[PDB]
């Protein structure tokens, strides 16, 4: 990528979620290249230098999640530890998305637990974060307690983003179910 070299003042105009997407494209163009993708970004790494851009450092782990989707490696736990470290909820935005997207289709267990205690941190913009993450890890599993807890957390919460993240979350858990899902589809539609 020459992008940051060819366009500069446009990237200096970036503010708020712009630096999220800016460092998120870093992972879209680096999609694949599983080996050096972590160390090659050291200049663009999710700092966390604290003149807070913090949607920046959230989008950095988002970039690492876009590359690590489907199969993956210890970088998944590398993002998991950083989810348990640094700040909140700015890390969970793209970080938990990285944790859930990398475990997508793998039917990961501990992610469902540590995302429940992460879901209880009670914020708004992180609503879509844990919702899409928990929906990706459970893809095709058609589990029970996962949808039960996602539909049980939607009451006391005041945010509509946790409703939409859990909307696609309980939507993504069921794939190719045909008439098997219609039992829940009747309740969701009614």
């Amino acid at each position: 990528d020459q992008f940051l070299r060819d366009n500069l003042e446009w990237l200096a105009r970036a503010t708020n979620w712009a630096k999220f997407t800016a460092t998120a494209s870093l992972g879209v163009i680096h999609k694949g290249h599983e080996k050096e993708a972590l160390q090659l970004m050291a200049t663009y790494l999710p700092k966390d230098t604290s003149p807070g851009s913090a949607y920046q450092e959230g989008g950095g782990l988002y970039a690492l999640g876009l590359i690590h989707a489907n199969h993956g490696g210890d970088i998944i736990d590398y993002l998991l530890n950083q989810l348990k470290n640094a700040s909140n909820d700015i890390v969970r935005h793209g970080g938990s998305l990285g944790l859930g997207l990398a475990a997508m289709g793998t039917a990961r267990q501990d992610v469902y637990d540590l995302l429940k205690t992460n879901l209880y941190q009670d914020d708004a913009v992180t609503g879509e974060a844990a919702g899409l993450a928990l929906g990706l890890v459970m893809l095709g599993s058609k589990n029970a307690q996962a949808i039960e807890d996602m539909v049980g957390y939607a009451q006391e919460t005041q945010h509509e983003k946790i409703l939409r993240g859990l909307a696609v979350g309980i939507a993504l858990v069921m794939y190719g179910r045909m008439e098997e899902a219609d039992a829940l589809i009747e309740s969701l539609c009614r």
């Binding site: 105009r13 503010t15 708020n16 979620w17 712009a18 708004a124 913009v125 005041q158 945010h159």
Partner: protein, 287 residues
């Protein structure tokens, strides 16, 4: 500093006090105050609305009575929830509910004290039923002339709020001001019962009385309006039989039709009221 797309969570009690305080002052513009809680920058809620008394100075920053605020918040302390004040509102029944010079003259005071203090205006006149009407205003910071004036991010509620683009003179305030989105939160049980509360109009008063009052009249004296309807039969259909011949002269449709369609079909729907409710007599009279 940081700016993000804003959403105003409103309570039905707030909107009720809004239009009620605005309807009692028509034509004269009144002055209220908004009550609620600031959760964060990108979301805000108004959980209550109370009205300020009208004074001789008119609508002005001095119209707010400090001893009224002290005694009201004390009356809110003995009330269940004593939430802190947030912002102000004033109704504009007589015109298109645009902020005047005094509205900004009190806005630098409300932005001084309170960080946000969103300004809301409401009018009964625009729509009698099917529109939110009301209005929304927030004063942009003049100290931001250095940086850019065009946030936010997550443009969803923003680009959808701008439309219609709200005329010219209103969006003439889009310079130095900007609107804010309003959504109705449920609270579905109360929204459903209050839904049926106004449905008592077109359904029935008790859901029993008014169409048992249609069992009171019940063709009474409802045939008098059938005699006027059959006079509309003779009237409208004697000129309706002149239409198809003229259609053969002018060859053919003048676009048209005169309409001069439907109508007494509804009179026959009252005949469905005739057959049904009179068939109830067999149930009423026998046991």
């Amino acid at each position: 500093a940081v700016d993000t797309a804003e959403q105003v969570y409103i309570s039905s009690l707030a909107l009720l006090k809004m239009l009620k305080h605005g309807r009692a002052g028509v034509p004269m513009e009144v002055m209220g105050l908004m009550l609620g809680e600031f959760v964060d920058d990108y979301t805000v809620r108004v959980i209550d609305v109370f009205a300020m008394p009208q004074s001789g100075t008119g609508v002005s920053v001095e119209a707010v009575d400090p001893v009224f605020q002290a005694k009201m918040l004390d009356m809110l302390k003995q009330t269940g929830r004593p939430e802190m004040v947030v912002g102000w509102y004033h109704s504009h029944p007589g015109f298109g509910c645009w902020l005047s010079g005094v509205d900004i003259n009190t806005q630098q005071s409300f932005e001084a004290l309170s960080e946000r203090a969103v300004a809301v205006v409401v009018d009964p006149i625009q729509s009698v039923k099917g529109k939110v009407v009301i209005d929304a205003f927030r004063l942009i910071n003049a100290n931001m002339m250095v940086l850019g004036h065009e946030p936010r991010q997550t443009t969803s509620n923003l680009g959808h709020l701008n439309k219609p683009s709200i005329q010219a003179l209103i969006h003439g305030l889009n310079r130095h001001y900007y609107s804010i989105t309003i959504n109705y939160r449920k609270n579905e049980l109360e929204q459903k019962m209050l839904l049926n509360l106004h449905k008592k109009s077109w359904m029935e008063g008790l859901t029993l009385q008014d169409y048992s009052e249609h069992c009171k009249h019940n063709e009474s004296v409802v045939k008098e309006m059938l005699e006027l309807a059959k006079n509309y039969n003779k009237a409208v259909e004697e000129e309706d039989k002149m239409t198809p011949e003229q259609l053969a002269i002018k060859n053919v449709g003048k676009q048209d039709p005169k309409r001069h369609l439907e109508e007494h079909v509804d009179v026959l729907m009252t005949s469905n009221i005739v057959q049904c409710l009179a068939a109830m007599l067999d149930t009423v009279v026998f046991k």
